[model samples]
Target: MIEPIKRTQVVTQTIHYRYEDGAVAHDDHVVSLIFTQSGKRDLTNGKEIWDSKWSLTQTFEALPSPVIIGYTADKPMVGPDEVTVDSKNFLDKQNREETVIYSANTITQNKKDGLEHHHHHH
Candidate 1:
């Protein structure tokens, strides 16, 4: 006489670092992952007898792209080694964002020496 079925899924991955007129150099890296599934509850077709229904792929460890010196990063790197989460749709995921566009290495070119020095007593 033992029954217990549980299910919980949550996924949120967002990382943005814009500086191409969008502002916000860097400071928006949020990653939340949680998927759980318990079994032992098949009481009269109550469902939930899955110990591992494909929910173990939150390998997010490739995030490495943050160096806004003069600004120049269309896409060096920003999380995506593996975020293949799938726990029966994984809460119907639709909360995944990724943006890193920093471009500002300006160069107009216009410089003419020290100019007008060493005036010989005039």
Candidate 2:
């Protein structure tokens, strides 16, 4: 009834940055979530369980986007923009893998012209 069950879980989030014109803006960034589960065992026809006590925090840190002139990008959360996933379960035996599709930034421009020809017509 009083036993120690320890395990380590790693969650990696991948980010891909690119330009709308099919150009590489930045290298793929990986945000990792490390959890050193230090749980305990149970009884009555049941196995050990993780209470997420010794594991890392639930909120994953955010990442900043690059700043390039003549380009505009989507406002994506440092952690999540479309989908959000952090918490983990003990049922599914599948590892957690998050993918961030950092849409390319579109180019922008400003057009201005000044001429001293034909201002007022009678």
Best by TM-score: 2
lDDT of 1 by residue, 1-122 (tens): 55876676767767787776988766678777766655577667666566656565665555677776666666656554445656667658645787877776434323222364432252
lDDT of 2 by residue, 1-122 (tens): 56777676655666566665656666567676555567778776567776743324445557667766655544344444222222354222223333333342343333222253332242
Best by lDDT: 1
Q: What range of 10 consecutive residues in model 2 has the weakest lDDT sum? A: 111-120
Q: Write down the lDDT of every candidate, Cα atoms only.
A: 0.64, 0.51
Q: Residue 21 of model 1: what lDDT?
A: 91
Off by over 4 Å in 2: 42-47, 51-57, 80-122
> Under the 3 Å rule for N, CA and C atoms, how many clashes does model 1 have?
0
Cα-lDDT of candidate 2? 0.51
Superposed on all Cα atoms, model 2 deviates from the true structure by an RMSD in Å of: 13.8
Please report how far candidate 2 places residue 88 from its true position, in Å. 6.4
